[model samples]
Target: PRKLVPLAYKQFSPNVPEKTLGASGRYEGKIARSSERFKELTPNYNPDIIFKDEENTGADRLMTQRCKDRLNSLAISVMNQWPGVKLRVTEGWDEDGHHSEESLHYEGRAVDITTSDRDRNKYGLLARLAVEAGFDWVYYESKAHVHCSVKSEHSAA
Candidate 1:
C-alpha cells in the first residue's frame, strides 16, 4: 500500500472522476457548528449502523449526535426510496492521515455512505437524498462513496 494514497478516499487513485456536489446542491439550511463553539459535543459510537471499512468498525459510533442523526435520518429516506437497500457506512472517523488535511472526519462530523455497489462510488439518488437530508456537504467521490458532512461551514473565498 502506498503511504501517500491507498484505497481510501483521502488519497484515492487518479483514475477516478472529479465530479462533486455543487454549492446549490448541498444543504444550506443551517449554520455549521463552529470549531470554537462545540468542543464539548464529542463523537459517540452507535451500534445500529454498519461499517463496511475495517477501520470504520467503531468509527461510525464515534460521531457527534448531529452527525449520527444525519446518517440515521438519511437511512430512513434511503429505505423509503428503496425498500431493501440498507446503508453501509464505508468511512467515518479516521485517525492520523487517513483523510485530507483539515477534514471534518477528524472532528467526527462526516461519514461515507454507500449501498455496497460494485463501483463503490455511492452515486445517483444517494447524492440527492443526502442533500435533502440536511447535510452541510454531500459529495459523490468518484472512488467508491458519497462523502457526507454536517458540521463547521467551510465558506469558499
Candidate 2:
C-alpha cells in the first residue's frame, strides 16, 4: 500500500496600487527610461528611488504631475549647463529613519545629489539652477550633497 500527499499552492500578482492603474489598465507609477534629460542614477530605478527603507513600504517617486515636470526641467537644466557631468541622485522618497519627520523626501518630492569636493563650485551652480528650474527649495545639506524639493502647499519649513 502507498500513501499520496497533496501539495499546497498560492497565487500572486504584482502589488500595484489601485490609484496608479490607468484607464488603459497599465501601472503609471513607472518612470520613462527613454527620457534624454534624466537617467536612473541608482542601481534599481524603481525600488531604489521609490521604496522607503524604514517602513519597508513602496512609495511613488513622483508625487504629482507637477513634481514630475519640475524634475524634468531640473534635469534638462543641469545637463545643458554642465556637459558630461555625472549627476548622481543620492536620496529620494527616504524613510530610512535618519531623516526628519517633516522631510519632503517622505512625500516623494525631494532628491539629494551627490557631489565631489572638486565640484563644489559646480554644485553651487547646480543648486541655483535647481531653483530656476522650478524646484521650490534647493540647498547644500552637506559637503557631500545638495538637496532639492518641489514646492507644495503642504510642505513643511
Candidate 3:
C-alpha cells in the first residue's frame, strides 16, 4: 500500500515572517510563481489556476506550506502508481472572483484537478489516491475536475 509522509517544519527568511506565510510556510504572499518547491512533481505549476483573471494579485493564490508539501507528495505518489499518466492541477487557491466565500481554496487548503471525459476512470482513481494520501476532503465533480482539500487537522499528513 502507498503511504504519505508527514510534513516537516521549515524555516523561512526573516523578511517573510511565519504568520504571513499562511498556516504552513509554503504561501509566501505574492512571490513569483517560479519560486516554489517540488519542481520534480509539478514542473508546470501554474499560479493562474488559482488567481482570478490569471493575474498575480498577491496573497490570493498562495497556499500553506504544509498544504503545498502534501500536494506535491500526492502528485508524486499518483505518478508512481500510474506511470506515464499526467496529472494537472486546474485549481490550487481561489480569490473572491473564482470561488465561494466558504471555499477552502481561499484558505490555501484545497485544489482541483482536471480530468478527461474520455478517461473517467482516471478521475476515480485519482480521488481514491488523494484520500489515501491524506486529503481531508475529496469531491468528484460532475463537470470536469476532482477537488481535494487538506484541512488544518490533516495538513501535516
Candidate 4:
C-alpha cells in the first residue's frame, strides 16, 4: 500500500507559545512549550498523517478569525493540488517583539511550510499558490518550505 503524505501545515495565529519553538530571528518566548506540553500538543496540532481532511489538533484556532480561515483555506488548496507532501510549521503568526526583537508572524502575516517535493519545480508550484493566496513574501529555497508573509514595507534586519 502507498502512504499518503500531507502537502502543507497551516498556521493562523502567533499564539503558539513563544517558548514552543526555539527563538529565531522570529520567536522569543521562554520555556518553548515544555517537552511534555509539546508531546501532548504535537499529535493534535500537527498535520494529519493521512489526508481524508481531518482538522488539526492543537487549538484548532488562530489569533484572529480572519487569518485562521485564510490560512486553512490556503493549506487545503495546496494539499488538494499535491497529495502526500508534508507541511511543517517552522513559524506561524507572531506578535511584534513577542519573543524576539521582531517576528513577521507576530504581525499575523507569515507562515513557514515544508513539502514532500524538495526539487525546484515542485517547490515552485507551492510558492506560486502561496503568493496567489495573498501571502506577500514566499521563500522557496531553504530545505523544502514555503515561507510566506503578508505584504508590508518593513524589512527584517
Please give each candidate's TM-score: 0.63, 0.53, 0.55, 0.45
| lDDT, candidate 2, 1-157, per-residue tens | 3332211111111122212222012221223334331232222333112222334433334344455566667666666766655444666655353476555565455676643223665665666665576665565666655676654432234
- C-alpha lDDT of candidate 3 relative to the true structure: 0.51
Top model number, lDDT: 1
Error of 4 at 18 (Å): 22
* Residue 124 in candidate 1, Cα distance off native in Å: 1.9
lDDT of 3 by residue, 13-107 (tens): 12232233232233223223454421212222443222332445444335665556666666676667666554556666554437654566655
Worst 10 residues of 2 by lDDT: 5-14
lDDT, model 1, position 24: 18
Of candidate 4, the 10-residue stretch with the lowest lDDT total is 22-31
Give per-residue CA lDDT, model 4, range 99-150, as digits (tens): 3455545444455554544444455566656655555345553444566554
Judging by lDDT, tell me the better candidate of 1 and 4.
Answer: 1
The Cα local distance difference test for each model comes to 0.58, 0.47, 0.51, 0.42
lDDT of 2 at 110: 67
Please tell me which model should have the higher TM-score, number 1 or number 3. 1
Candidate 1 all-Cα RMSD: 10.1
Per-residue lDDT tens digits for candidate 1, residues 1-157, read 3232123344322223222333212322211245453452454434444576575345455666767777878777777756766666877766545765666666667787777443344355676677667676666665567777765343453
Off by over 4 Å in 4: 1-63, 94-100, 116-121, 151-157
Clashes of each: 5, 0, 2, 14
